[PDB]
Chains A and B, each alone.
With several copies, the nearest count.
Chain A
């Protein structure tokens, strides 16, 4: 329902948590940031989240985040989802 709809076959999902109660933290000070093919609408999600929560930007921590990875280079004997 965007003004300009963005196309993606990459299947975003939302498991954002609350740092005000969750004991999660990231001692790694070197964020690996994000590849371009994932940033199709993550920024647009930040605008979507700021519709009701404009006072906070998406504090991304990736030590617990994961991601499905294909195995097309060898015939895919398995689907090995790994951390981001």
Chain B
């Protein structure tokens, strides 16, 4: 139920599976050959994206799960200019 996300920088960002199943590429990566038992490890090594981008995309996963239809008031997602661009450059590879 808790999948593991390994960055290229070595930092793991284990998040809830339902939070991590909103990315189509992660949807395919968890599927395909094998799903382990209970997805207790279910590790995937995103050997290209940086660690801060992986942290930001896990934050976005939580954000989207919390505010998928949460009325009309939704908090603004804070994005630093230095952490942008590469967040979207990796949002390709983590198509949401």
Check whether chain A touches chain B (CB < 8 angstroms): yes
B68 proximal to A (CB < 8 A): no
Interface residue tally for chain B (C-beta within 8 Å): 4
| A18 proximal to B (CB < 8 A) | no
In the complex, the number of residue pairs spanning A and B with C-beta atoms less than 8 Å apart equals 6
> Does A3 lie at the interface of the complex (its beta carbon under 8 Å from any beta carbon of B)?
yes
B-chain residues with CB within 8 Å of residue A1 when the two chains form the complex: 69, 71
A54 within 8 A of B: no
A5 nearest CB neighbor, chain B only: B71
Q: How large is the interface on A (under 10, 10 to 19, 20 to 34, 35 or more residues)?
A: under 10
Closest beta carbon of chain A to B86's beta carbon, Å: 33
Residue A2 CB within 8 A of the other chain: yes
- CB neighbours (8 Å) of B73 from chain A are 3
Which residue of chain B has the shortest Cβ distance to A2 in the bound complex?
A: B71
A3 contact set on B, CB distance < 8 A: 71-73
Residue of A nearest to B74 (CB): A3
- B6-27 vs A, CB cutoff 8 Å, 1 = contact: the mask equals 0000000000000000000000
Give the A-binding residues of B (Cβ under 8 A).
69, 71-73
A-B CB contact pairs (8 Å), 6 listed: A1-B69, A1-B71, A2-B71, A3-B71, A3-B72, A3-B73
